[PDB]
Amino acid sequence: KIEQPRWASKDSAAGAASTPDEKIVLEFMDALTSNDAAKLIEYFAEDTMYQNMPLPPAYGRDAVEQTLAGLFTVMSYDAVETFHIGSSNGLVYTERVDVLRALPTGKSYNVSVLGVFQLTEGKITGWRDYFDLREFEEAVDLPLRG
Amino acid sequence: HHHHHHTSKIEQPRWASKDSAAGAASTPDEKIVLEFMDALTSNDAAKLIEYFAEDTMYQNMPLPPAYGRDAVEQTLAGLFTVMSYDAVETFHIGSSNGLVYTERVDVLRALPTGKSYNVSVLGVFQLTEGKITGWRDYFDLREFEEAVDLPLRG
Ligand SMILES: [K+]
Ligand SMILES: [K+]
Ligand code: NI
Ligand code: NI
């Protein structure tokens, strides 16, 4: 389960994809729990990028896929609850909670995230997740930045 | 007391759609937010809280939320005690369903240390009747703290 924060909009539509791009992203999200870089990479354009901002950016489609793969080595998504999704000028935004589990220790933690996606022809030409890395490491005892 | 350590210039990221347009206010609420951003460099909580509704909240997600206008101002004012906005740059602004989104860079100075850092922020704003009923900034707190030696957590 994921209880929904008091501050989450009570507009019934703020959770639902409103546009094509948004449907995609929501699906991509749904596909994240596959924990499969090779599968996930599909949503991406050739000319793309990716970054969990506390960590370094990955440019180009195969870097992106490779970063994904390496992450999936120590951790796995158990759940993605997306509270708000919105869009303007070709970028899509998601406020969600990712339930991530750390493979080495088995502990999981509910990470508060706000991501931006850049799409071009339904192709993810960009993906950037903003969150606090430290409280995650501390929770599941899995360091990722020295 | 330490001298003021060298502000770092704001870089246009490889991914920041030049374009912009994409960084311009396309809607009324957006123009409001863009204006609120402008106000932040005033480092004046009194100026800022007048953008808020009574039913409102404020949270830097690595830090505790403030609910209610009264708690919001205490938070804002408290931050301005140890910290100061030198600049804010918004690459991407957008909006749907009553929420505005800003992908921006915050240039902050730690008052006690004189040191400066550029925080990569993605923040979301909820508005109502033209007033901020919610404000949440997402970023990594540790990389900021270490950069300028201002531990804030707890
Ligand atoms: K929506
Ligand atoms: K815009
Ligand atoms: Ni000292
Ligand atoms: Ni000094």
Taken in order of first residue, the domains within chain B and their CATH numbers are: 1-154 (3.10.450.50)
Residue among A81, A130, A93 nearest A18 (CA): A93
Residue A55 φ/ψ, nearest 5 degrees = -115, 175
- The single-letter code of the amino acid at A51 is Q
CB atoms within 10 A of CB A122: 11
Q: Burial-class residue B80 by CB neighbours within 10 Å (0-12, 13-18, 19+).
A: middle
Query: What residues does B102 pair with on adjacent strands?
Result: B93, B123
Beta-sheet strand order (sheet of B99-110): B66-67, B57-60, B131-138, B116-128, B99-110, B83-96
Residues 6+ apart with CB under 8 A from B46: none
As a whole number of angstroms, the distance between CA B118 and CA B78 comes to 20
- Which ligand is located closest to the Cα atom of residue B149? 3
Cβ atoms B103, B133 nearer than 8 A: no
Method: X-ray
Token pair of A8 as six digits: 């989450």
CA distance A34 to chain B (A): 25
From the CA of A134, how many Å to the nearest CA of chain B?
6
Query: A85 in contact with B at a CB cutoff of 8 Å?
Result: yes
User: Cβ contacts of residue A90 below 8 Å, gap of 6+?
Assistant: A21, A118, A119, A120, B17, B22
Residue A3 burial class via C-beta count within 10 angstroms: exposed 0-12, middle 13-18, buried 19 and up: exposed
CA torsion angle B123 A54 B143 B4 (round to 10): -60
Would residue B106 show up in a list of annotated catalytic residues for this protein? yes
A133-140 and B141-148 are packed helices; what angle lies between their axes, rounded to 10 degrees?
110
* Resolution of the entry in angstroms: 2.5
Q: Is A124 within 8 Å of A45 (Cβ atoms)?
A: yes
Residue among B19, B26, B124 minimizing CB distance to A114: B124
Whether A133 and chain B come into contact, CB under 8 Å, resolves to yes
